[PDB]
Amino acid sequence: VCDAFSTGKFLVAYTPPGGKLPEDRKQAMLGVHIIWDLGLQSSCTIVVPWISSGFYRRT
Amino acid sequence: GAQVSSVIKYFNINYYKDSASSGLSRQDFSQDPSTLTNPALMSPSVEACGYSDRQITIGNSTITTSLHTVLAYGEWPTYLSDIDATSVDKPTHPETSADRFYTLDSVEWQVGSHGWWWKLPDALKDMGVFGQNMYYHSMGRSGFIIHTQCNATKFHSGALIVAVIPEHQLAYVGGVKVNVGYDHTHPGQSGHQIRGPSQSNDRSGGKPDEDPLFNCNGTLLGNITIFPHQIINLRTNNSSTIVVPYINCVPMDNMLKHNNLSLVIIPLVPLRPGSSGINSVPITVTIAPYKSEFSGAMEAQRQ
Amino acid sequence: GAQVSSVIKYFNINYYKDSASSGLSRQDFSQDPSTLTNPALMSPSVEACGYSDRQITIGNSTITTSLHTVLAYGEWPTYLSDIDATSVDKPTHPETSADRFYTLDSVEWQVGSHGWWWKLPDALKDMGVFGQNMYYHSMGRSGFIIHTQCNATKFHSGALIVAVIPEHQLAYVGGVKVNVGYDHTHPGQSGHQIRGPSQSNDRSGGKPDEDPLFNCNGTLLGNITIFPHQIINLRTNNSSTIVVPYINCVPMDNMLKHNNLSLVIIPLVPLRPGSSGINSVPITVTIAPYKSEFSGAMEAQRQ
């Protein structure tokens, strides 16, 4: 939520099970990621994939 | 009720309407009637199914020996395929670069040497581009080919047991309730020399059990033959080969945390030199990842 | 003699019996007769051949932008196949684990910033399991997808030239006869900020030329459009995408020694803030190895 004149590029990164929280962008980009760009709003949604050993994950 | 979709018929009925509410499971027949051995156990000869898949060469490295290969659980290694897999994400197949024979540090086999063990995939974690794909991926599965080779002369004597134990869970070295440490059960390629048993063995930091007779887990040797194994008798053969598929409940596991195999080598009968003066002989182990798959790529899990 | 197997016929004759002893090469015809443009140059639109190969996603990473992608030399990247290859040894294809978008360190674009360049594959040498496969393999080939993205507002101004130069051979920073150092032409992911020209620029250890007008190699800007390129004009577009095949004489080269591409980004017109108070904007580069192949596995060439 901003004005129409603002613009931005965001990196949305999902680090799979077993990985540390990245602490810097070069370690975040190596997982699942999407580049969310304003002025599209087709790029907003990241789909967290199902990556797991077992078939189910405990709530 | 429900049902479902010297010889006694019975009407199949679920009184409670459900599966798993049903009673114990028998062997059905549609019409009247009117098994003794399991070749999957007993460690077949890898010709006892088919030899077309095998002179043994995986991925740029050659073994020349293959009727005496034991095929663990009579199942040939294969990729996860589909329909048995959890994630739809396409795994990575390194193939010939990460599927190749990795020879480890040789170990002197002496008089009084109690045994050795290596955990897998762990032993390979620093080896080549297989050991790189472990860290950069969430999960993975691999079958292995273990080639154990110990050569002495016709004057020497003594036998080894080369066994592959799925999920070999070590016992703590004694006393109180402690989990063996992450570091002592992940030794790397050097494996673990079994130095016990003794009452003087150190107890700290969760060190594993040093007793070879109880398999370090509390179950006798000589029953270790229920696993895939070969017996290297220096009167007969100098080497060993074992082809293990991927054994686990899960399609893919971490490979850093979970070691789904163990390579155990026990001097069943000691090494006696003959008229020769050689008191010790090297044992060499060569492991080949085979049909390995990796998925869930990330930053290297390396610390 | 030999021959071989306004309109003038001629009897094709090798007087010396050989090819390459023959004279200059014309365009033959079998019967009587009775071209202006090369779309491979001019950097096509990647729809100008076909768009079925492309929302841009390689190997677990997504780009959402693809009619404005330029397809370098009108050729789509593809594996070495056969018959063009030297070794028969089967290359390794890492696919989605090592073929993915790697975003590099962003660079402030300021007033007075002369330019930037990155050498490829070099920029990716520490990136993921692509940068691992470089060291563990003798040779390799890869196509790349360069996505350059710089966003400012409607108040800002200024243009960039994003060009990909095959075999961009840097000039030494001046004077005597020196080869630029291995280290200065292999900067890593950080690339090289062009800080010149000046008479005061340091000359030591083979440092590369700092002059952006002469392309650091001695050839003008504005002729840099003969390479695959895009012009990012902050009045029009914020981003760029370029798809390069594998350009080289050899099927596979080392990738540590030989950098077969360069990504050059030149502020053709400076960055002027408008009524806004923002004096600098980040430029971000995202490189995807595509259709990469590795062969000749060895110990890591890493020092």
XYZ file of C-alpha atoms in Angstrom:
665
model
C 0.000 0.000 0.000
C 1.787 3.074 -1.326
C 1.188 5.774 -3.891
C 1.136 5.157 -7.620
C 4.537 6.788 -8.163
C 6.471 4.423 -5.879
C 8.272 1.425 -7.323
C 10.099 -1.526 -5.831
C 11.628 -4.953 -6.334
C 11.380 -7.486 -3.508
C 12.883 -10.957 -3.143
C 10.586 -13.464 -1.426
C 12.536 -16.575 -0.447
C 11.416 -19.850 1.161
C 14.235 -21.786 2.824
C 13.353 -25.488 2.933
C 13.338 -27.682 6.041
C 16.782 -28.116 7.524
C 18.241 -24.812 6.389
C 19.207 -21.921 8.610
C 17.509 -18.571 8.367
C 19.611 -16.871 5.704
C 21.022 -13.723 7.418
C 21.947 -12.246 4.016
C 20.319 -12.105 0.621
C 22.908 -14.244 -1.173
C 22.016 -17.114 1.134
C 18.277 -16.466 0.812
C 18.271 -16.511 -2.987
C 19.570 -20.064 -3.145
C 16.214 -21.527 -2.123
C 12.774 -21.165 -3.601
C 12.289 -17.516 -4.410
C 10.254 -15.095 -6.497
C 10.959 -11.477 -7.399
C 7.933 -9.424 -6.425
C 7.775 -6.259 -8.502
C 5.415 -3.381 -7.934
C 3.514 -2.235 -10.966
C 2.537 -5.831 -11.757
C 0.616 -7.417 -8.844
C 0.802 -10.672 -10.770
C 4.147 -11.335 -9.050
C 2.919 -10.954 -5.464
C 2.065 -14.572 -4.706
C 4.744 -17.038 -3.693
C 3.582 -20.632 -3.403
C 5.435 -22.312 -0.555
C 6.144 -25.737 -2.076
C 5.704 -28.950 -0.164
C 9.214 -30.162 0.586
C 9.281 -32.736 3.339
C 10.712 -36.095 4.220
C 7.574 -37.514 5.795
C 4.196 -37.312 4.162
C 2.727 -35.011 6.819
C 4.045 -32.140 8.904
C 3.073 -31.628 12.536
C 1.004 -28.512 13.188
C -23.281 -54.306 8.231
C -20.583 -53.263 5.773
C -18.396 -55.930 4.123
C -15.789 -54.298 1.792
C -14.647 -54.394 -1.838
C -10.137 -78.258 6.820
C -11.101 -75.271 4.658
C -13.572 -72.788 6.131
C -15.448 -70.147 4.182
C -16.528 -66.961 5.859
C -18.707 -64.003 5.007
C -16.428 -60.982 5.020
C -18.231 -58.418 7.164
C -17.198 -55.176 8.805
C -19.678 -54.777 11.630
C -18.258 -51.373 12.347
C -18.277 -49.838 8.904
C -14.625 -49.005 8.279
C -11.262 -50.516 7.521
C -8.895 -50.794 10.490
C -11.927 -51.560 12.583
C -11.663 -54.967 10.950
C -10.192 -57.898 12.805
C -6.894 -59.607 12.190
C -5.737 -60.206 8.621
C -5.821 -63.677 7.039
C -5.197 -64.854 3.463
C -8.416 -64.720 1.431
C -9.461 -66.853 -1.507
C -12.272 -66.345 -3.992
C -12.924 -70.065 -4.522
C -11.948 -73.136 -2.546
C -8.343 -74.120 -2.124
C -8.645 -77.693 -3.388
C 6.132 -70.117 0.576
C 8.810 -71.883 2.580
C 11.778 -69.600 1.804
C 12.271 -65.896 1.147
C 15.050 -65.343 -1.402
C 14.949 -61.595 -0.730
C 16.502 -62.338 2.643
C 19.556 -64.643 2.608
C 21.388 -62.014 0.462
C 21.099 -63.199 -3.162
C 23.962 -63.404 -5.640
C 22.912 -60.451 -7.916
C 22.755 -63.085 -10.605
C 19.828 -64.598 -8.696
C 17.644 -61.875 -10.192
C 19.506 -60.524 -13.197
C 23.108 -59.779 -14.135
C 22.419 -57.385 -17.020
C 22.994 -54.489 -14.617
C 26.360 -55.811 -13.362
C 34.144 -55.784 -14.496
C 32.032 -53.280 -12.552
C 32.111 -49.625 -13.594
C 30.003 -46.767 -12.244
C 30.582 -43.257 -13.378
C 34.165 -43.032 -14.649
C 35.632 -45.488 -12.093
C 36.229 -49.182 -12.720
C 36.045 -52.320 -10.587
C 37.282 -55.585 -12.099
C 36.355 -58.648 -10.053
C 30.477 -60.176 -9.938
C 28.700 -63.474 -9.458
C 29.802 -63.130 -5.818
C 28.182 -59.726 -5.425
C 25.359 -59.900 -2.883
C 22.265 -57.914 -3.798
C 20.817 -56.637 -0.565
C 17.216 -57.743 -0.059
C 17.178 -58.994 -3.640
C 16.273 -55.540 -4.900
C 18.189 -53.577 -7.405
C 18.695 -49.847 -6.696
C 16.464 -47.560 -8.706
C 15.293 -43.982 -8.789
C 12.330 -42.956 -6.664
C 10.159 -42.941 -9.806
C 6.753 -41.473 -8.911
C 3.649 -42.448 -6.901
C 5.965 -43.476 -4.067
C 7.194 -39.882 -3.776
C 5.960 -37.096 -1.522
C 7.012 -33.897 -3.280
C 6.237 -33.401 -6.954
C 9.426 -31.316 -7.288
C 11.788 -32.909 -9.781
C 14.825 -34.372 -7.995
C 18.341 -33.818 -9.257
C 20.275 -36.758 -10.634
C 24.031 -36.075 -10.541
C 24.721 -39.419 -12.295
C 28.316 -40.217 -13.262
C 29.908 -37.259 -11.477
C 28.493 -38.045 -8.034
C 27.831 -41.739 -8.698
C 31.310 -43.243 -8.644
C 33.581 -45.374 -6.497
C 35.081 -43.461 -3.572
C 37.909 -45.337 -1.866
C 38.351 -44.499 1.798
C 41.357 -44.563 4.114
C 42.686 -48.092 4.449
C 42.775 -49.591 7.937
C 45.417 -51.938 9.301
C 43.987 -55.300 10.237
C 46.130 -56.597 13.069
C 46.000 -59.226 15.757
C 43.566 -57.967 18.362
C 41.752 -55.508 16.111
C 38.120 -55.721 17.186
C 36.378 -54.199 14.183
C 35.444 -51.071 12.280
C 32.269 -49.326 11.197
C 31.327 -46.549 8.788
C 27.994 -44.747 8.665
C 26.450 -43.985 5.284
C 25.892 -41.548 3.527
C 28.030 -39.866 6.209
C 31.330 -41.433 5.150
C 30.934 -39.733 1.770
C 30.050 -36.267 3.054
C 33.414 -34.761 2.071
C 33.860 -36.969 -1.006
C 33.572 -35.292 -4.399
C 30.388 -33.806 -5.828
C 28.343 -36.351 -3.953
C 29.462 -34.791 -0.700
C 28.679 -31.377 -2.155
C 25.102 -32.272 -3.090
C 24.387 -33.377 0.482
C 24.815 -29.882 1.870
C 23.101 -27.935 -0.889
C 19.921 -30.034 -0.809
C 17.215 -30.544 1.785
C 16.724 -34.224 1.153
C 18.181 -37.067 -0.792
C 18.201 -40.773 -1.413
C 20.923 -43.027 -2.728
C 21.718 -46.641 -3.205
C 25.281 -47.712 -2.558
C 27.747 -50.328 -3.747
C 30.240 -51.349 -1.063
C 33.398 -53.047 -2.317
C 35.550 -54.309 0.559
C 38.941 -55.648 -0.474
C 41.590 -57.230 1.766
C 44.419 -59.230 0.217
C 46.883 -61.475 2.041
C 48.957 -64.464 0.973
C 48.305 -68.193 1.125
C 50.281 -68.275 4.368
C 47.930 -65.912 6.206
C 44.690 -66.815 7.919
C 41.636 -65.283 9.491
C 38.213 -64.105 8.398
C 36.154 -60.920 8.341
C 32.415 -60.306 8.404
C 31.394 -57.467 6.102
C 27.800 -56.550 6.932
C 25.499 -53.665 6.049
C 23.020 -52.868 8.831
C 20.009 -50.673 8.002
C 19.404 -48.209 10.837
C 22.236 -49.309 13.097
C 21.513 -47.504 16.348
C 24.523 -47.467 18.629
C 24.369 -48.080 22.359
C 25.930 -45.576 24.710
C 29.213 -46.754 26.176
C 27.604 -47.589 29.490
C 25.757 -46.690 32.630
C 23.288 -43.822 32.773
C 20.767 -42.593 30.204
C 22.562 -40.598 27.508
C 22.139 -40.176 23.782
C 25.337 -40.873 21.880
C 26.724 -37.617 20.567
C 26.092 -36.369 17.058
C 29.842 -36.253 16.507
C 30.703 -39.780 17.612
C 28.130 -41.385 15.316
C 29.185 -39.143 12.399
C 32.918 -39.902 12.274
C 33.421 -39.056 8.600
C 35.350 -41.262 6.220
C 37.667 -42.523 8.951
C 34.797 -44.469 10.440
C 35.107 -45.791 13.959
C 37.647 -48.309 15.194
C 36.012 -50.531 17.806
C 38.465 -50.459 20.707
C 36.514 -52.347 23.372
C 35.081 -53.928 25.427
C 36.595 -52.831 28.724
C 35.457 -51.429 32.041
C 38.004 -48.642 31.453
C 36.500 -47.322 28.195
C 35.789 -43.622 28.505
C 32.218 -42.537 29.208
C 31.645 -38.934 28.142
C 29.821 -36.870 25.559
C 27.727 -39.835 24.503
C 30.363 -42.066 23.195
C 29.197 -45.173 21.327
C 29.503 -48.723 22.558
C 32.870 -50.352 21.882
C 31.801 -54.018 22.200
C 31.892 -55.900 18.853
C 30.175 -59.075 20.094
C 26.906 -57.304 20.884
C 27.092 -55.312 17.625
C 27.400 -52.175 19.752
C 23.581 -52.268 19.836
C 23.126 -55.252 22.163
C 22.498 -58.069 19.654
C 24.935 -60.934 19.135
C 27.349 -61.457 16.319
C 26.583 -64.522 14.309
C 23.037 -63.258 14.079
C 24.548 -60.389 12.097
C 24.049 -62.662 9.086
C 20.387 -61.631 8.866
C 21.578 -58.399 7.248
C 23.215 -58.276 3.823
C 26.717 -59.553 4.407
C 29.719 -61.388 3.075
C 32.391 -63.366 4.892
C 35.904 -62.731 3.596
C 38.002 -65.811 4.319
C 41.662 -65.347 3.473
C 41.781 -69.015 2.489
C 39.175 -68.374 -0.214
C 38.398 -64.801 -1.336
C 40.170 -61.489 -0.861
C 37.297 -59.105 -1.580
C 33.605 -58.357 -1.183
C 30.852 -56.510 -3.010
C 27.397 -55.579 -1.705
C 24.685 -53.703 -3.610
C 22.172 -52.011 -1.299
C 19.030 -50.235 -2.523
C 17.633 -47.266 -0.605
C 16.085 -48.604 2.607
C 13.929 -46.161 4.584
C 10.283 -45.481 5.397
C 10.501 -42.036 3.799
C 11.117 -41.385 0.082
C 13.921 -38.928 0.912
C 15.567 -37.934 4.176
C 18.152 -35.334 5.150
C 21.433 -37.324 4.764
C 23.150 -35.069 7.257
C 21.074 -36.049 10.286
C 19.924 -39.544 9.330
C 22.403 -42.316 8.525
C 20.297 -45.048 6.977
C 23.113 -47.610 6.695
C 26.189 -48.836 8.494
C 29.125 -50.732 7.055
C 30.452 -53.006 9.798
C 33.623 -55.071 9.363
C 34.334 -57.502 12.214
C 37.403 -59.752 12.446
C 35.381 -62.899 13.120
C 38.573 -64.993 13.345
C 41.830 -63.157 14.111
C 44.620 -62.552 11.641
C 47.384 -65.084 12.078
C 50.567 -64.792 10.009
C 51.919 -68.031 8.652
C 55.578 -68.715 8.055
C 55.436 -65.148 6.696
C 56.452 -62.285 8.925
C 53.598 -59.928 8.043
C 51.605 -59.153 11.176
C 49.040 -56.777 9.650
C 47.226 -56.297 6.352
C 45.294 -53.272 5.041
C 41.548 -53.429 4.564
C 40.259 -50.997 1.956
C 36.661 -49.902 1.425
C 35.340 -48.415 -1.819
C 31.817 -46.948 -1.779
C 29.862 -45.956 -4.885
C 26.705 -43.858 -4.579
C 24.291 -45.343 -7.058
C 20.956 -43.996 -8.288
C 21.266 -40.959 -6.029
C 18.608 -38.233 -6.028
C 18.576 -34.815 -4.418
C 15.776 -32.317 -3.938
C 15.034 -29.211 -1.935
C 18.026 -27.127 -2.971
C 19.170 -24.438 -0.530
C 22.278 -22.758 0.837
C 24.912 -25.235 1.947
C 23.858 -26.714 5.281
C 27.579 -26.669 6.028
C 28.170 -24.810 9.284
C 43.359 -32.034 -63.123
C 41.082 -32.771 -60.178
C 37.734 -30.950 -59.875
C 35.884 -32.030 -56.665
C 32.559 -33.523 -55.569
C 26.085 -11.090 -66.507
C 26.147 -14.735 -65.391
C 29.346 -16.687 -66.019
C 29.683 -20.449 -65.856
C 32.979 -22.021 -64.962
C 34.453 -25.492 -64.927
C 35.298 -26.237 -61.314
C 38.876 -27.508 -61.399
C 41.526 -28.068 -58.765
C 44.764 -27.915 -60.711
C 46.632 -28.924 -57.611
C 44.638 -31.925 -56.505
C 43.441 -30.970 -53.029
C 41.039 -28.759 -51.156
C 42.571 -25.641 -49.600
C 44.796 -25.463 -52.629
C 41.674 -24.138 -54.314
C 41.237 -20.453 -54.968
C 38.869 -18.066 -53.273
C 35.335 -19.199 -52.464
C 32.327 -17.981 -54.471
C 28.657 -19.023 -54.431
C 28.067 -21.931 -56.820
C 24.936 -22.840 -58.728
C 24.046 -26.044 -60.539
C 21.934 -24.338 -63.217
C 21.675 -20.743 -64.361
C 20.418 -18.049 -62.058
C 17.682 -16.690 -64.321
C 20.207 -11.662 -48.202
C 20.113 -8.015 -47.207
C 19.737 -8.410 -43.422
C 20.932 -10.884 -40.806
C 18.308 -11.324 -38.077
C 20.778 -13.346 -35.998
C 22.650 -10.109 -35.398
C 20.523 -7.129 -34.286
C 19.564 -9.122 -31.127
C 16.128 -10.650 -31.826
C 13.153 -10.527 -29.479
C 13.132 -14.260 -28.445
C 9.678 -14.257 -29.948
C 11.344 -13.662 -33.320
C 12.182 -17.365 -33.386
C 9.874 -19.041 -30.899
C 8.397 -18.239 -27.496
C 7.491 -21.794 -26.461
C 10.721 -21.919 -24.449
C 10.037 -18.643 -22.590
C 6.761 -15.386 -16.224
C 10.242 -16.894 -16.579
C 11.228 -19.773 -14.302
C 14.406 -21.851 -14.408
C 15.092 -24.439 -11.806
C 13.088 -23.515 -8.703
C 13.459 -19.720 -9.126
C 10.901 -17.454 -10.775
C 11.089 -14.313 -12.903
C 7.839 -12.515 -13.728
C 8.221 -9.848 -16.406
C 9.334 -11.792 -22.052
C 8.592 -10.328 -25.455
C 11.366 -7.848 -24.596
C 13.901 -10.586 -23.927
C 16.725 -10.412 -26.469
C 17.936 -13.769 -27.739
C 21.632 -13.408 -28.363
C 22.579 -14.235 -31.949
C 19.068 -15.570 -32.487
C 20.077 -18.948 -31.107
C 18.466 -20.689 -28.248
C 20.772 -22.371 -25.693
C 20.989 -26.125 -26.021
C 23.091 -29.025 -24.857
C 26.228 -29.924 -26.779
C 24.363 -32.878 -28.322
C 26.868 -35.004 -30.264
C 28.942 -34.778 -33.468
C 30.001 -31.292 -32.385
C 31.680 -32.767 -29.301
C 35.285 -33.826 -28.802
C 35.166 -36.346 -25.961
C 32.690 -39.209 -26.061
C 32.504 -39.108 -22.242
C 28.965 -38.371 -21.114
C 28.739 -34.861 -19.638
C 26.930 -34.172 -16.396
C 23.740 -32.147 -16.476
C 23.015 -30.622 -13.050
C 19.697 -29.193 -14.348
C 17.417 -27.438 -11.855
C 19.868 -27.450 -8.947
C 22.679 -25.647 -10.769
C 20.475 -24.041 -13.431
C 18.696 -21.298 -11.513
C 18.656 -17.542 -11.069
C 21.526 -16.272 -8.922
C 21.089 -12.653 -7.853
C 24.335 -10.805 -7.237
C 25.254 -7.882 -4.998
C 23.332 -4.786 -6.020
C 25.359 -1.745 -7.052
C 24.465 1.876 -6.387
C 23.955 3.824 -9.576
C 24.928 7.391 -8.791
C 25.805 10.564 -10.612
C 29.287 10.068 -12.001
C 29.269 6.276 -11.876
C 31.136 5.203 -14.998
C 30.016 1.596 -15.318
C 30.350 -1.970 -14.112
C 31.328 -5.315 -15.578
C 31.078 -8.960 -14.553
C 32.908 -11.856 -16.175
C 31.038 -15.106 -16.757
C 31.025 -17.959 -15.663
C 33.387 -16.362 -13.121
C 30.733 -14.325 -11.312
C 28.988 -17.585 -10.417
C 32.048 -19.466 -9.176
C 30.992 -19.291 -5.514
C 27.256 -19.480 -6.255
C 25.456 -22.678 -5.286
C 26.027 -26.067 -6.891
C 26.874 -24.394 -10.155
C 29.947 -22.901 -8.543
C 30.740 -26.307 -7.075
C 30.624 -28.102 -10.427
C 33.164 -25.668 -11.881
C 35.922 -26.842 -9.571
C 35.205 -30.559 -9.633
C 35.178 -30.798 -13.436
C 37.838 -30.321 -16.085
C 35.614 -28.618 -18.603
C 32.162 -27.229 -18.974
C 29.779 -25.244 -21.096
C 26.746 -23.216 -20.141
C 24.289 -20.813 -21.593
C 23.181 -17.953 -19.390
C 20.146 -15.752 -18.862
C 21.033 -12.269 -17.622
C 18.199 -10.335 -15.993
C 19.223 -6.759 -15.182
C 16.677 -4.804 -13.168
C 16.876 -1.149 -12.104
C 13.750 0.636 -10.898
C 13.334 4.372 -10.346
C 10.326 6.680 -10.362
C 8.760 8.793 -13.089
C 10.731 11.751 -11.750
C 14.127 10.150 -12.375
C 16.041 10.086 -15.628
C 19.016 8.497 -17.292
C 19.774 5.379 -19.291
C 21.969 2.292 -19.076
C 23.471 0.048 -21.735
C 23.363 -3.613 -20.744
C 25.593 -5.523 -23.157
C 27.043 -9.028 -23.261
C 30.448 -9.151 -24.969
C 31.809 -12.547 -26.055
C 35.527 -12.743 -25.276
C 35.930 -9.288 -23.782
C 39.687 -8.883 -23.512
C 40.627 -6.042 -21.208
C 43.372 -3.541 -21.930
C 46.060 -2.951 -19.350
C 45.645 0.317 -17.487
C 48.386 1.976 -19.487
C 51.937 2.320 -20.649
C 54.258 -0.656 -20.964
C 53.577 -4.219 -22.111
C 51.865 -6.153 -19.319
C 49.202 -8.823 -19.175
C 46.339 -7.882 -16.883
C 46.506 -10.006 -13.768
C 44.500 -13.176 -13.320
C 42.970 -11.675 -10.193
C 41.813 -8.363 -11.641
C 39.934 -10.002 -14.514
C 38.394 -12.597 -12.159
C 36.770 -10.302 -9.586
C 34.081 -12.740 -8.449
C 30.456 -11.770 -8.037
C 31.315 -8.196 -7.083
C 32.405 -7.546 -10.637
C 34.480 -4.486 -11.388
C 33.427 -0.886 -10.898
C 34.907 1.224 -13.689
C 36.535 4.125 -11.853
C 38.324 5.895 -14.706
C 39.618 7.375 -16.922
C 42.372 9.387 -15.266
C 46.104 9.874 -15.572
C 46.264 9.059 -11.842
C 44.763 5.551 -12.072
C 47.103 3.037 -10.491
C 49.309 0.958 -12.779
C 50.448 -2.234 -11.056
C 49.966 -5.977 -11.149
C 48.252 -5.786 -14.513
C 45.263 -3.812 -13.615
C 42.538 -3.539 -16.262
C 41.641 -0.420 -18.180
C 39.244 1.916 -16.378
C 37.970 3.875 -19.415
C 34.291 3.143 -20.234
C 34.207 5.007 -23.563
C 36.738 2.699 -25.210
C 35.061 -0.380 -23.682
C 38.272 -0.954 -21.726
C 39.457 -2.779 -24.867
C 39.963 0.241 -27.135
C 36.703 0.228 -29.137
C 34.091 2.964 -28.821
C 30.818 2.862 -27.002
C 27.878 3.227 -29.294
C 29.415 0.500 -31.396
C 28.808 -1.711 -28.365
C 25.381 -2.298 -29.912
C 26.842 -4.932 -32.245
C 26.810 -7.320 -29.282
C 23.610 -8.581 -27.671
C 22.367 -5.659 -25.634
C 19.447 -3.764 -24.206
C 19.096 -0.096 -23.329
C 17.301 0.520 -20.039
C 15.685 3.951 -20.203
C 14.121 5.014 -16.924
C 11.433 6.812 -18.921
C 10.373 3.500 -20.474
C 11.514 0.191 -18.930
C 13.033 -0.723 -15.585
C 14.537 -4.105 -16.455
C 16.362 -6.213 -19.019
C 16.663 -9.846 -20.037
C 19.241 -11.415 -22.361
C 19.481 -15.091 -23.324
C 22.969 -16.073 -24.504
C 23.839 -19.505 -25.917
C 27.316 -20.959 -25.422
C 29.701 -19.010 -27.662
C 33.191 -20.482 -28.091
C 35.302 -22.279 -30.683
C 35.691 -25.282 -28.381
C 32.835 -27.566 -27.265
C 33.893 -27.209 -23.612
C 36.527 -25.085 -21.909
C 37.841 -24.846 -18.358
C 35.521 -22.156 -16.855
C 38.150 -21.245 -14.304
C 40.730 -19.897 -16.749
C 38.540 -18.835 -19.669
C 35.731 -16.304 -19.246
C 33.742 -16.555 -22.453
C 31.358 -13.678 -21.669
C 31.250 -10.290 -20.022
C 28.234 -8.453 -18.677
C 28.891 -4.734 -19.118
C 26.527 -2.080 -17.745
C 27.378 1.489 -18.782
C 25.491 4.600 -17.644
C 25.058 5.959 -21.167
C 23.206 9.028 -19.837
C 23.760 9.967 -16.180
C 21.222 9.547 -13.417
C 19.450 12.801 -12.703
C 16.957 13.012 -9.832
C 13.811 14.943 -10.558
C 11.867 16.876 -7.971
C 12.620 13.755 -5.903
C 15.557 13.772 -3.543
C 16.910 10.321 -4.403
C 20.437 10.664 -5.755
C 21.191 6.969 -6.331
C 19.328 3.810 -7.302
C 20.392 0.152 -6.999
C 21.069 -1.925 -10.082
C 20.590 -5.645 -9.526
C 21.815 -8.470 -11.751
C 20.353 -11.983 -11.737
C 22.203 -14.669 -13.719
C 20.796 -18.110 -14.515
C 23.068 -20.853 -15.847
C 21.053 -22.594 -18.510
C 21.760 -25.855 -20.330
C 25.026 -26.287 -18.439
C 27.217 -29.353 -18.981
C 30.256 -30.581 -17.101
C 32.762 -33.293 -17.922
C 36.177 -34.453 -16.823
C 35.484 -34.862 -13.119
C 38.465 -34.545 -10.771
C 39.471 -33.229 -7.365
C 38.308 -29.680 -6.766
C 40.570 -27.321 -8.698
C 40.060 -25.028 -5.718
C 43.447 -23.989 -4.356
